[PDB]
Amino acid sequence: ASLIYRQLLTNSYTVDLSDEIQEIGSTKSQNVTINPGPFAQTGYAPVN
Amino acid sequence: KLTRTRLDRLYGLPAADPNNGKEYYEIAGRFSLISLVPSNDDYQTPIA
């Protein structure tokens, strides 16, 4: 009856195939890099 | 000087012939223009 544990561990490479099957159906999206930092304070010029 | 008129040796370009047939009034000069330009730096692009 331990064969169940042994085989569950052995035949685990198919988990990757299942993951690929899920991934292909997953909706994909991309993110762009965020401009970081203490942005310089620039204000209006002196006008009249 | 305008002939057959009062003005004699008046000064100032008239509305008659300021071009004098000159090709063009070529003025060469530099210009420094400080303006608030738009830019995202090298950001806001895909992470790859």
* Helix/strand class of chain A: mainly alpha
The description of the largest β-sheet of chain A is: none
**Of all protein chain pairs, which has the greatest interface, and how many residues does each chain bring to it?**
A-B, 7 and 8 residues
Shape of chain A: rod-shaped
- Report the helical percentage of chain A: 40-55%
Count up the helices of chain A.
2
Q: Measured on Cα atoms, how large is the radius of gyration of chain A?
A: 27 Å
- Strand portion of chain A: under 5%
* Span of the ends, CA to CA of chain A: 91 Å
Organism (chain A): Rotavirus A
Subcellular location (chain A): Virion
Protein name (chain A): Outer capsid protein VP8*
PDB class: viral protein
Question: How are the SSEs placed, and which strands pair?
Answer:
The structure is cut from a larger assembly and holds two copies of chain A (48 residues).
Chain A: H1 3-10, H2 14-25
Organism (chain A): Rotavirus A
Subcellular location (chain A): Virion
Protein name (chain A): Outer capsid protein VP8*
